[PDB]
């Protein structure tokens, strides 16, 4: 009817127009935003990646952009802004073809055929570095650090990343290594110098007082039980109606607990970690101070992350009430360390844990809350770049330079393909050339001239050279330290091809009532 | 009151049904367009849909003609299998051609009887075109693979489709007719397998077993009961009052812990070491059961239990005070296995016969649910093929053939319904045009040539419109059973007619 | 407020009347069409019978409501004719308007319309005059039933419904009683059945079943203890309630209520019973004593519902447990739970091989709409058949009768000297409204259909030849067996004139507007 | 479509009805005079239906048929000019009803002629013969018609004179038709109504000749339609002036010419010549005229084109428009030609006795004052028109509007017996009839619907009973007071009316 024609044209207009605004990426371009919200709050933003994940929209076509960034982070952890901008290119293709009289189902098909050919050509130009070899990993990690904010804490960070991923690794080029095994914890105190890689499992938690086990031998505690004591879960016949009577009930309650924590220690506990959700109050607030005395660690109202990691890696299973004695299904352990460092920080390290041959943890340290943040982003990207090699190896051009390069090789393959699909893909080759162009355009004034020029300089270099996108100048782009993993650009194409395709597929208005 | 007058009622009836119609028509047939449903009015989300059930129910009806059709078609999907897309699209296509009739000025009863006699002609021609392919039972297996293959595709599944063809065919075949949610019980969980599904031998239950209750039971004898304590049992010496002041709030809570121990001794009397209760308790009550040595397995399913009961001769039924009231089921070991990366308590001892349990593994919950509904419609079509092992070639090839036969009779037989018999025939052919342009073939050209060919006796060749080409349907396998199509046709004609009959809508 | 008089009064009356008339005419006869209507409750109600349409709508102006009342009396007396009476009424008001603009006062219209309808009742009296015994009636009756069942849509495998109805009017009724028996008739519908199974229940059905399956599924002839006694909580109108606390009062109460329930079972069984029907039913506790002193019982019977079961069976009352005797016990032939054709329909029958003074007509259908439709087909069908059992005078519907009458009225119209003559002839066109409106339903042009029927009434002067009313390509009303009671049509014609005569008479209207409900 | 003629036709009907409404209140002797404003700003007082339509009509296509319809009435009967409009508009009221019902226009047009054919039967049976060769019978029927007409004051004296003219033109028993193509209305200044007389020959207008002879017996009727002089130059004469010499040169030609013409006429033998004007003949010479008179030939110069065509048929004095065509055949035979200067001042040529085909009578109507002459001219016209109607159609029917109810009642009953789809058309047509006697009764003064209900009932029982009576204003027999109309005057009203209604229905 008229419902399918008008929806496709507007939804494509509406994502694409926002994608035009958004395309100011790489380097210093556009003008800052101080943002008066639709709820009246002052918000300040910088960085393309951080914005896209945060972005709060209600236009169904634009929501695709938000979530596209998140999938990219999970597979690559690189190219999070990149994947959105190139998706906006595919949208640019879709309008011009509707006018030509190529039907929407056909334009979907062509995206697959664009993907299949494109990624194969990415693998062709790529120089295949080894994913278990440290030297090439070390160069690649520098590339990602030096493109982020750091340029002097980069020195410390490159080698820690090659070591961290080495612990989790699996020899193959198949999909392995994750940030479900790479555990990332923050700690106030230490410095970027003192950041520590523990090959086992270390959990981030807060431990009461300072004066507790920092030595070897531990039985790691995963409990799901509340105490039995007077006015807890055991009978008392003393009913209070006075401050004095209140005092008695609490005294006998805390007293029995001082006995109880000895049976907890008999086990070998030097670590106990309490469940997230109570069954009354859990171990009482009195119990925690008594436990501290036995030399046994605490955390009530534990985060979600810890519960998942403990059970998986160390094989740690729930245990019976203490009056009934612990069931002993707890895993192996040998370290209960409360990490203090430059006067601050509370942490649990578990060393001599059982493992499935995975799971590393990096501790992220900084003497000030902003200084931790500065280590944290930079390391995240450096871990992830080496990661991408195990999942699928090799190095291609970085900054999104092979999507510009890919355009030349790809036009040729469309013409000789000589399908219905050829025209859709050829038109996408020309759209991938707009990405350094569009980026610059919005910032200033005088748009047209520079825009045409950047496409000439990259194209003419041929199938092996063009303009760099992290230094400028026509020079070899395939190895020169302007590289990124094969995984980053193939992943980006893949994700884009799926999300965009979906806009074409709908017909007629739809709105659940 | 509100009175919507004679022309206007019929106009609301046509546009409303057309709009809902165009949602399920994209997914229908071979691969063409899909629906991605846009949710903003309930909640703000996007949804990936391919099943007609999801599309039609989730969007309300606020157009009175539209209500009737979505209800008739949803029930047809359960019984018949693939009645959601099929019934709604044809009913919508017929109203379009009513619109034409009425402006011209043909009375609604001419239209109603023309469509109806024409449905009787279509049905007679579908019987003609349908021929057996289940005359050896191994040949029957193959016939069922084709039918199954067709349903499964053009519904988004990653690699769960490939298993399901073989799965559904096995399940139906051995049982003979009937339902098949009893011959294959669908347990859905996430695993480390991205989109794989397998046949379990035993029933396996999700939930970790912790505490002093042991993870390995040896020599299980299972006492089946469908009720039990939610987390606390009330009884003769269970009823008390212990709360009336603010400190007395903790004392009653103490007391409730005690009530948990009272339920344990109830089972202890029986001497049946495996007690199943259908509801979950907490981790703290579990210590009491495990201590005594009559183990409680909580969060049990009715479907799983039913699987064991059939092979062992047990009974699924409540009431327990002795184990002589409710017959026992058996397994050897109930051993904690890890499948995927999620820890499961797995009952093993008996395998197959009257029921299997099928365990699906994904990583999204959406994939499991989607998979079940695809599969479901399939199992229903295959249920009907046991009774009538005729099969008739489709993809849109069937729908043109019946339409050719209805056009021939449309000229000869009637005294005034000619125009209407033809309109019925053209509406069946609307479905093969829409899919042609998604495919990259010319709609007009497709419907006008092969239609004469297949009718003359080339029933094999039919519409392959996932490539826009003429292909053999005996070799490519775009063939569905006789039964499923006969009933959705019946349904769709009735549904359109019901709302076509309506010349005034009163709203009070 | 405004004073509406004359033209203002009569203009308003056509505007209101027509709206109702248009729905009815497009749902008229066995070629009739379903009307699917939505309420503002989000619900949908699928209607076709003229009475349900009048209940549904609350359109503006008094005139709508006056048609509503009229149809209700007639559902009990005739049955069907609900669509027919209203469409004929609007025809009178359209014609009256044609004559009103010519310059004819409404009192002229009023007397001449009343006088014309007397011409028509005389014409309709000619067609039959037979009154025949009950057995002989049974074949004509079943043919009439098809038609009536057909005008609520579908009649295929509805031949059970017709044959149970002949039994149903005979039992409750006499032949020359001349009174109504539809307050002796209980219509019952339950979802999950079939429209292909229709059963005649010579007693009564309670939707309740036995307390246990372990208790016997048969009970002897008679010996029914009718009771108002609790074996569960009776929900007292007393006031402040108090609950047990602790283990000891809990136990005391339980043993007390158990002890009292056993004593009660014994006194019932001693005065002679084997069925307890108790107002306030049975609890889980109460089940234990009742199996143990072995006496089938129904758990729960409604407050008024207990009276209805007593009169029907003819059984002799026992109000309460305080009133137990062996000289007063209710009637039965057997008490057994019945599965009709499915286990989705479970009703428990107290059926009679003794005195029956009511008949329960149990019709089933698989879904809510299907039972609705089936109950209304069957009740109206039953009523038309009660007029015919008494006096088996039959006329063939489909508008054939009306055409003949239109010829008779049109001639007699002009042979009077008074100023009514013009009204009387408009009356003749107004009778023709009904095969005209049938035609709209058939799929045929309104005009040529009436005049085909008319030539055939010039020949005979009797309806038994006409046009299509089932649709089968016959020009017969006696090879189609389209049959309505003689009193019934005569009733639609006389009632409609009587009503519309009040409406022409009243031209004195105090409304602020033009219509108020 | 035929939607747009449907919309045009209703608009045309409504305009035609509105113009026709004025005439329903102008109907009969009791009619209401209409004060009519021209596009010229003059008030015209008329009670004659026909001239109201003619003098100004609206610009719609049905309005035009009405002028045409009454124009046709005048030639055919000369009577019922008012009544004929009444039935036309009344029929168009009936048609809207049929149309809405779904009786197509083609049906209503054939049914409307079929109903005329059916109407005429019923009428005739009522009618009753009178003699057509007897003077007295035709006079009584004419006298009754005159009281009903607008003019009546001198019509007593003009009625026996109107019959006398007509009796001579009736020679066989069939009584021919009698048109006005044989009865000539000539007026003369001066004289009374008693002085009026029927001249056997023809009376011609004016009389130019005082040098001629004034009484010549045994005269030969000669006809000039050729010149008497050589052609125009710039005057009707060949002679013109612009120099003394210039006139001389034309005179040489003229002189020769005038002698040969005047002499040529005399040689063939003529003693009456009929000469036209000097603007209807291209040359005539005063010189040629002086000689032409002085040869002793009786001359009338100056006469109309209409007169010249009239004479040529009636007295058989055929065209002579050239010299070549004066031969004996063309000439008449007159018995006498005579100047009369009595019975009204001024001189006219009487030819008394003429050899004539058919028979041609002329009535010199006359009166004292200019307005007396005009009243009697109207009066003979009215009187003669009714006589001619009765000699064509021998039987006699009643006036008063009673026949009009009597046809209708029969036509309703018969239609129902016959039946058919066209039944509705013939029944509504009969009811169209009921308007005209009703409209008449209102003008006579008595409540109109009540009058026409009662006369219907008198016709139903008795038949030949009551009618609208001018004394009573109402319901009293017209058998006690003869109100007669000729049979053709009523046949004309109906058949012409139907034809007009037929064209409009057929008209897109």
Contact status, residue B305 vs residue B350, Cβ threshold 8 Å:
no
- Nearest Cα neighbor of A135 from A363, A366, A395 is A395
- Asked whether residue C354 is marked as a ligand-binding residue, the answer is no
Q: Which residues of C are catalytic?
A: 49, 82-83, 380
Report the residue from C407, C446, C454 with minimal CB separation from D102: C446
- Interface residue ranges in chain B relative to chain C, Cβ cutoff 8 Å: 1, 3, 5-6, 64-65, 67-68, 107-113, 236-237, 239-241, 415-416, 498-499, 501-508
- Nearest Cα neighbor of C228 from C262, C274, C279, C192 is C279
Report the residue from B38, B247, B253 with minimal CB separation from A511: B38
Minimal-distance CA residue of chain C relative to B102: C443
Q: Tally Cβ neighbours within 10 Å of residue C170.
A: 18
- Nearest Cα neighbor of A84 from A35, A1, A178, A19 is A19
CA distance C495 to C503: 13
Chains near D, with 3+ CB pairs < 8 A?
Answer: C
CA distance B185 to B217: 24
D345-377: b or e for each residue (b if 16 or more CB lie within 10 Å)? eebbbbbeebebeeebbbbbbbbeeeebbebbb
Between strands C276-278 and C225-227, the pairing is parallel
C10-30: b or e for each residue (b if 16 or more CB lie within 10 Å)? bebbbebbebbbbbbbbbbbb
CA distance D115 to D129: 25
Contact B241 C39 (CB under 8 A): no
Contact C447 D424 (CB under 8 A): yes
CA distance B450 to A71: 47
Q: CA torsion sign, A190 to A194 to A195 to A198?
A: negative
Contact A324 B291 (CB under 8 A): yes
- Asked whether residue B86 is marked as a ligand-binding residue, the answer is yes
- D421 interfaces chain C, CB cutoff of 8 Å: yes
What technique solved it? cryo-EM
CA distance D415 to D426: 6
β partners of residue D273: D299
Backbone φ and ψ for B353, nearest 5 degrees, come out as 100, -95
Q: Where are the alpha helices (DSSP H) in A126-187?
A: 134-147, 154-168
- Nearest Cα neighbor of C56 from C19, C91, C85 is C19
Record the tokens describing residue A168, joined without a space: 């989790």
D82 is catalytic: yes
Interface B–C counts its CB contacts (< 8 A) at 92
Report the residue from D101, D454, D457 with minimal CB separation from C447: D101
Sheet holding B329-330, edge to edge: B295-298, B274-277, B221-223, B329-330
Q: CA torsion sign, A481 to A485 to A486 to A490?
A: negative
CA distance A297 to A336: 8
Contact B112 C246 (CB under 8 A): no
* Closest CA–CA distance from residue A423 to any residue of chain B (Å): 14
Contact status, residue B474 vs residue B460, Cβ threshold 8 Å:
yes
Sheet holding D395-398, edge to edge: D128-129, D395-398, D484-486
Q: Which residue has tokens 């007159």?
A: D334
Between strands D361-367 and D197-199, the pairing is antiparallel
Helix/strand/coil (H, E, C) string of B210-243? Answer: CCCCCCEEECCEEECCCCCCCCCCCCCCCCCCCC
Contact status, residue B213 vs residue B289, Cβ threshold 8 Å:
yes
Binding residues of A for ADP: 27, 79-82, 146-148, 399, 484
CA distance C206 to B286: 47
Q: Tally Cβ neighbours within 10 Å of residue D219.
A: 24
Q: Report resolution in angstroms.
A: 7.7
- C422 interfaces chain D, CB cutoff of 8 Å: yes
- Asked whether residue B83 is marked as a ligand-binding residue, the answer is yes
- Nearest Cα neighbor of D272 from D332, D225, D202, D324 is D332
Q: CB burial class (10 A; 0-12, 13-18, 19+) of residue C42?
A: exposed
A507 is catalytic: no
Q: How many H-runs (helices) and E-runs (strands) does chain D carry?
A: 16, 16
Q: Tally Cβ neighbours within 10 Å of residue B353.
A: 12
Contact status, residue C318 vs residue C329, Cβ threshold 8 Å:
yes
- Nearest Cα neighbor of B113 from C377, C156, C47, C31 is C31
C-alpha to C-alpha distances, B179 to B49, B204, B304, B315, D24, nearest whole angstrom: 25, 22, 16, 20, 84
Write down the catalytic residue from D48, D93, D195, D302. Answer: D48
Q: Flag whether A touches C (3+ CB pairs, 8 A cutoff).
A: no
**DSSP code for D221:** B
Contact status, residue A269 vs residue A296, Cβ threshold 8 Å:
yes
Q: CB burial class (10 A; 0-12, 13-18, 19+) of residue B314?
A: buried
Q: CB burial class (10 A; 0-12, 13-18, 19+) of residue B483?
A: buried
Backbone φ and ψ for D350, nearest 5 degrees, come out as -115, 140
**DSSP code for D233:** S
CA distance B317 to B298: 16
Phi-psi region of D136 (alpha: psi -120 to 50; beta: other; left: phi over 0): alpha
Query: Which positions in chain B touch C57 (Cβ < 8 Å)?
Result: 1, 3, 506, 508
Write down the catalytic residue from D182, D236, D314, D382. Answer: D382
Determine the distance from the C-alpha atom of residue C142 to the mean position of all C-alpha atoms in its chain, rounded to a whole number: 18
Contact status, residue B89 vs residue B399, Cβ threshold 8 Å:
no
Contact B251 A329 (CB under 8 A): no
Helix/strand/coil (H, E, C) string of B256-281? Answer: HHHHHHHHHHHHHHHCCCEEEECCCC
C-alpha to C-alpha distances, A385 to A144, A160, A177, D190, D270, nearest whole angstrom: 7, 13, 12, 135, 139
Chains near A, with 3+ CB pairs < 8 A?
Answer: B
C-alpha to C-alpha distances, A50 to A53, A73, A435, nearest whole angstrom: 6, 11, 20
CA distance C228 to C231: 10
Give contacts of C 370-409 with D, CB under 8 A.
407
Contact status, residue D27 vs residue D86, Cβ threshold 8 Å:
yes
Contact B38 A280 (CB under 8 A): no
Q: How many H-runs (helices) and E-runs (strands) does chain B carry?
A: 17, 20
CA distance B251 to B258: 11
Question: SS3 for D282?
Answer: coil
CA distance A66 to A87: 12
Query: Which positions in chain C touch D449 (Cβ < 8 Å)?
Result: 102-104, 419, 422
Contact status, residue B39 vs residue A18, Cβ threshold 8 Å:
no
Contact status, residue C502 vs residue C114, Cβ threshold 8 Å:
no
Q: Tally Cβ neighbours within 10 Å of residue D469.
A: 17
Minimal-distance CA residue of chain B relative to A241: B247
CA distance A435 to A89: 8
Minimal-distance CA residue of chain C relative to B240: C246
- Nearest Cα neighbor of C32 from C173, C149, C159 is C149
Question: SS3 for D497?
Answer: helix
Q: Which residues of B are catalytic?
A: 51, 84-85, 377
Minimal-distance CA residue of chain C relative to B415: C473
Mutate to test the interface with A, among B155, B254, B436, B437 (most CBs of A within 10 A): B254
* Closest CA–CA distance from residue C413 to any residue of chain D (Å): 10
Contact status, residue A298 vs residue A284, Cβ threshold 8 Å:
no
CA distance B286 to B295: 8
CA distance D285 to D260: 13
Concatenating the DSSP letter of every residue in D414-449 gives: HHHHH-STTHHHHHHHHHHTTHHHHHHHHHHSS-HH
- Nearest Cα neighbor of A123 from A493, A446, A378 is A493
Contact status, residue C131 vs residue C388, Cβ threshold 8 Å:
no
- C455 interfaces chain D, CB cutoff of 8 Å: yes
> How many residues are there in chain A?
513
- C458 interfaces chain D, CB cutoff of 8 Å: yes
Q: How many CA atoms lie less than 13 Å away from A298 in the CB half-sphere?
A: 23
Torsion of CA A252, A254, A257, A261, to 10 degrees: -150
Contact D423 C454 (CB under 8 A): yes
- Asked whether residue B153 is marked as a ligand-binding residue, the answer is yes
CA distance C85 to C71: 8
CA distance D352 to D350: 6
CA angle B395-B400-B406, nearest 5°? 145
- Nearest Cα neighbor of C396 from C464, C442, C342, C341 is C464
D66 Cβ neighbours under 8 A, 6+ residues apart: D16, D19, D20, D53, D57, D85, D88, D500
**DSSP code for C245:** -
Report the residue from C36, C39, C444 with minimal CB separation from B502: C36
A196 Cβ neighbours under 8 A, 6+ residues apart: A190, A362, A363, A365
β partners of residue B170: none
- Nearest Cα neighbor of D389 from D50, D153, D132, D120 is D132
Query: Which positions in chain B touch C59 (Cβ < 8 Å)?
Result: 1, 3, 506
Beta strands in C285-356 (DSSP E): 297-298, 334-339, 346-351
Contact D420 C447 (CB under 8 A): no
CA distance A455 to A468: 12
- Asked whether residue D218 is marked as a ligand-binding residue, the answer is no
D438-447: b or e for each residue (b if 16 or more CB lie within 10 Å)? bbbbbbbeee
CA angle C293-C294-C296, nearest 5°? 135
CA distance D317 to D319: 7
Contact C60 B240 (CB under 8 A): no
CA distance C17 to C19: 6
CA distance C374 to C366: 11
Contact status, residue A397 vs residue A485, Cβ threshold 8 Å:
no
Chains near B, with 3+ CB pairs < 8 A?
Answer: A, C
- C252 interfaces chain D, CB cutoff of 8 Å: no
Between strands C483-485 and B274-277, the pairing is unpaired
CA distance C183 to D311: 99
Torsion of CA B432, B434, B440, B441, to 10 degrees: 40
Question: SS3 for A338?
Answer: coil
Q: CA torsion sign, C167 to C168 to C169 to C174?
A: positive
Q: What is the CA radius of gyration of chain C?
A: 28
Q: Tally Cβ neighbours within 10 Å of residue A184.
A: 15
Beta strands in C39-87 (DSSP E): 44-47
Report the residue from C23, C244, C441 with minimal CB separation from B506: C23
């Amino acid at each position: 009817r008229d419902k399918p024609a008008q929806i496709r044209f507007s939804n494509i207009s509406a994502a694409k127009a926002v994608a035009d605004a958004i395309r100011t990426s790489l380097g210093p371009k556009g003008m800052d935003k101080m943002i008066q919200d639709g709820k009246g709050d002052v918000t300040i933003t910088n960085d393309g990646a951080t914005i896209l994940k945060q972005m709060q929209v209600l236009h169904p076509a634009a929501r695709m952009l938000v979530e596209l960034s998140k999938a990219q982070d999970i597979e690559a952890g690189d190219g999070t802004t990149s994947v959105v901008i190139i998706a906006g290119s595919l949208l640019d293709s879709c309008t011009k073809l509707l006018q030509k009289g190529i039907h929407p189902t056909i334009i979907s098909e062509s995206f697959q055929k664009a993907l299949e050919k494109g990624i194969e050509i990415l693998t062709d130009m790529s120089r295949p570095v080894e994913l278990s070899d440290r030297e090439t990993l070390l160069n690649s990690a520098t590339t990602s650090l030096n493109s982020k904010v750091v340029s002097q804490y980069s020195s410390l960070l490159s080698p820690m990343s090659v070591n961290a991923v080495m612990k989790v690794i699996d020899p193959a080029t198949a999909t392995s290594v994750d940030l479900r095994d790479i555990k990332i914890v923050k700690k106030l105190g230490g410095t970027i110098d003192d950041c520590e890689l523990v090959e086992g499992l270390v959990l981030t938690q807060k431990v009461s007082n300072s004066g507790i086990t920092r030595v070897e031998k531990a039985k790691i505690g995963l409990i799901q039980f509340c105490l039995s004591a007077p006015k807890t879960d055991m009978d008392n016949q003393i009913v209070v109606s006075d401050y004095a009577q209140m005092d008695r009930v609490l005294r006998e309650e805390r007293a029995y607990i001082l006995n109880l924590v000895k049976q907890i220690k008999k086990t070998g506990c030097n670590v106990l970690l309490i469940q997230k959700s109570i069954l009354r109050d859990a171990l009482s607030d009195l119990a925690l101070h008594f436990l501290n005395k036995m030399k046994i660690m605490v955390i009530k109202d534990i985060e979600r992350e810890d519960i998942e990691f403990i059970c998986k890696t160390i094989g740690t299973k729930p245990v019976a009430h203490i009056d009934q004695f612990t069931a002993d299904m707890l895993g192996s352990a040998e370290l209960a360390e409360e990490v203090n460092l430059n006067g601050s920080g509370k942490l649990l390290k578990i060393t001599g844990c059982a493992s499935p041959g995975k799971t590393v943890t990096i501790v992220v340290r900084g003497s000030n809350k902003l200084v931790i943040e500065e280590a944290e982003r930079s390391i995240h990207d450096a871990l992830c770049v080496i990661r991408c090699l195990v999942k699928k190896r090799a190095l291609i051009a970085g900054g999104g330079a092979p999507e510009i390069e890919l355009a030349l090789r790809l036009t040729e393959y469309s013409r000789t393909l000589s399908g219905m699909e050829s025209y859709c893909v050829r038109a996408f080759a020309d759209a991938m050339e707009v990405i350094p162009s569009t980026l610059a355009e919005n910032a200033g004034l005088n748009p047209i001239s520079t825009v045409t020029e950047l496409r000439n300089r990259h194209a003419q270099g041929e199938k092996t050279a063009g303009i760099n996108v992290r230094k400028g100048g026509i020079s070899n782009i395939l190895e020169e330290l302007v590289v990124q993993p094969l995984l980053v650009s193939v992943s980006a194409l893949t994700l884009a091809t799926e999300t965009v395709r979906s806009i074409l597929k709908i017909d007629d208005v739809v709105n659940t009532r | 009151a509100d009175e919507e007058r004679a022309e206007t009622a019929r106009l609301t009836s046509f546009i409303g049904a057309i709009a809902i119609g165009d949602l399920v028509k994209s997914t229908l047939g071979p691969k063409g367009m899909d629906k991605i449903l846009l949710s903003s009015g309930r909640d703000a989300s996007l949804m990936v849909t391919n099943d007609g059930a999801t599309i039609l129910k989730n969007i309300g009806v606020d157009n009175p003609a539209a209500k009737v059709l979505v209800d008739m078609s949803r029930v047809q999907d359960d019984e018949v299998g693939d009645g959601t897309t099929s019934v709604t699209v044809l009913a919508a296509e017929l109203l379009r051609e009513a619109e034409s009739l009425i402006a011209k000025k043909i009375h609604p009863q001419t239209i109603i009887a023309g469509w109806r006699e024409a449905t009787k002609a279509a049905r007679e021609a579908l019987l003609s075109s349908a021929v057996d392919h289940g005359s050896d039972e191994v040949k029957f297996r193959q016939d069922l693979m084709n039918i199954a293959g067709t349903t499964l595709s053009s519904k988004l599944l990653t690699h769960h489709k490939d298993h399901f063809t073989k799965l559904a065919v096995e399940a139906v075949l051995r049982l003979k007719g009937s339902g098949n949610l009893e011959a294959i019980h669908i347990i859905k969980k996430l695993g480390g397998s991205l989109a794989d599904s397998y046949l379990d031998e035993g029933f396996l239950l999700d939930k970790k077993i912790g505490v002093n209750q042991p993870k390995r039971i040896e020599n299980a004898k299972i006492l089946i009961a469908n009720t039990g304590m939610d987390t606390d049992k009330i009884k003769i010496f269970g009823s008390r009052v212990r709360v009336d002041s603010t400190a007395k709030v903790a004392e009653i809570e103490h007391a409730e812990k005690e009530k948990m121990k009272e339920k344990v001794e109830r089972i202890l009397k029986h001497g049946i070491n495996c007690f199943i209760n259908r509801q979950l308790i907490y981790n703290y009550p579990e210590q009491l059961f495990g201590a005594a040595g009559v183990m409680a397995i909580e969060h049990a399913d009715f479907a799983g239990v039913e699987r064991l009961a059939l092979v062992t001769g047990g009974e699924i039924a409540s009431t327990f005070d002795h184990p002589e009231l409710v017959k026992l089921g058996s397994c050897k070991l109930i051993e904690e296995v890890m499948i995927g990366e999620d820890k499961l308590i797995h009952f093993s001892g008996v395998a197959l016969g009257e029921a299997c349990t099928i365990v699906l593994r994904g990583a999204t919950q959406q994939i499991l649910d989607e998979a079940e509904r695809s599969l479901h419609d399939a199992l229903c079509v295959l249920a009907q093929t046991v009774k009538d092992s005729r099969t008739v070639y489709g993809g849109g090839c069937s729908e043109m053939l019946m339409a050719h036969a209805v056009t021939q009779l449309a000229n000869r037989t009637p005294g005034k319904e000619a125009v209407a018999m033809e309109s019925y025939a053209k509406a069946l052919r609307m479905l093969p045009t829409i899919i042609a342009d998604n495919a990259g073939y010319d709609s007009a050209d497709l419907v006008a040539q092969l239609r004469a060919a297949h009718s003359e006796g080339n029933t094999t060749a039919g519409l392959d419109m996932r490539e826009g080409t003429i292909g053999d349907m005996a070799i490519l396998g775009i063939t569905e059973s006789f039964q499923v199509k006969r009933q959705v046709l019946l349904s769709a004609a009735e549904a359109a007619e019901v709302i076509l009959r309506v010349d005034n809508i009163i709203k009070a | 407020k405004s004073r509406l008089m004359g033209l203002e009064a009569l203009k308003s009356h056509i505007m209101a009347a027509k709206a109702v008339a248009n729905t009815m005419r497009t749902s008229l006869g066995p070629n009739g069409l379903d009307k699917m209507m939505v309420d503002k409750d989000g619900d949908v109600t699928v209607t076709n019978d003229g009475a349900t349409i009048l209940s549904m709508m609350d359109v503006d102006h008094q005139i709508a409501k006056l048609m509503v009342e009229l149809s209700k009396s007639q559902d009990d007396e005739i049955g069907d004719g609900t669509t027919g009476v209203v469409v004929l009424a609007g025809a009178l008001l359209e014609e009256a308007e044609q004559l009103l603009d010519r310059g004819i006062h409404p009192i002229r219209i009023a007397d001449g319309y009343e006088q014309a309808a007397r011409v028509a009742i005389e014409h309709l009296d000619k067609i039959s005059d037979s009154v025949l015994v009950d057995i002989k009636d049974t074949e004509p009756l079943i043919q009439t039933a098809k038609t009536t069942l057909g005008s609520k849509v579908v009649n295929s495998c509805h031949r059970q419904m017709a044959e149970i109805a002949v039994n149903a009017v005979l039992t409750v009724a006499d032949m020359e009683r001349r009174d109504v028996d539809f307050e002796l008739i209980k219509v019952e519908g339950k979802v999950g059945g079939r429209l292909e199974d229709t059963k005649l229940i010579k007693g009564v059905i309670v939707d309740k079943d036995f307390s246990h399956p372990q208790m016997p599924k048969k009970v002897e002839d008679a010996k029914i203890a009718i009771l108002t006694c609790p074996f569960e909580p009776p929900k007292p109108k007393t006031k402040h309630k108090l609950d047990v606390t602790s283990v000891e009062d809990y136990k005391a109460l339980q043993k007390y209520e158990k002890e009292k329930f056993e004593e009660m079972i014994q006194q019932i069984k001693e005065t002679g019973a084997n069925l307890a029907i108790c107002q306030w039913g049975f609890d889980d506790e109460a089940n234990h004593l009742l199996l143990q002193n072995n006496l089938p019982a129904v758990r729960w019977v409604g407050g008024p519902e207990i009276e209805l079961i007593a009169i029907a069976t003819g059984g002799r009352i026992v109000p309460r447990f305080s009133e137990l005797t062996a000289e007063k016990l209710g009637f039965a032939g057997l008490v057994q739970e019945i599965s009709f054709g499915t286990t989705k329909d479970k009703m428990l029958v107290i059926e009679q091989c003794k005195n029956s003074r009511a008949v329960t007509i149990f019709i089933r259908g698989g879904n809510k709409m299907i039972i609705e439709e089936a109950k209304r087909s069957l009740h109206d069908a039953l009523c038309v058949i009660r007029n015919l059992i008494r006096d088996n005078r039959v006329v063939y519907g489909g508008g054939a009768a009306e055409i003949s009458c239109a010829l008779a009225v049109s001639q007699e119209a002009d042979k009077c000297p008074t100023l009514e003559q013009y009204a009387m002839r408009a009356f003749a066109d107004a009778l023709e409204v009904i095969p005209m409106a049938l035609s709209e339903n058939s799929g045929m042009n309104p005009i040529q259909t009436m005049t085909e029927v008319r030539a055939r009434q010039v020949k005979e002067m009797n309806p038994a030849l006409g046009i299509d009313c089932l649709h089968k390509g016959t020009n017969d009303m006696k090879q189609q067996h389209v049959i309505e009671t003689l009193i019934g049509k005569k009733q639609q014609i006389s009632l409609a004139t009587q009503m519309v005569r009040m409406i022409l008479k009243i031209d004195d209207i105090r409304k602020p507007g033009e219509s108020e409900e």
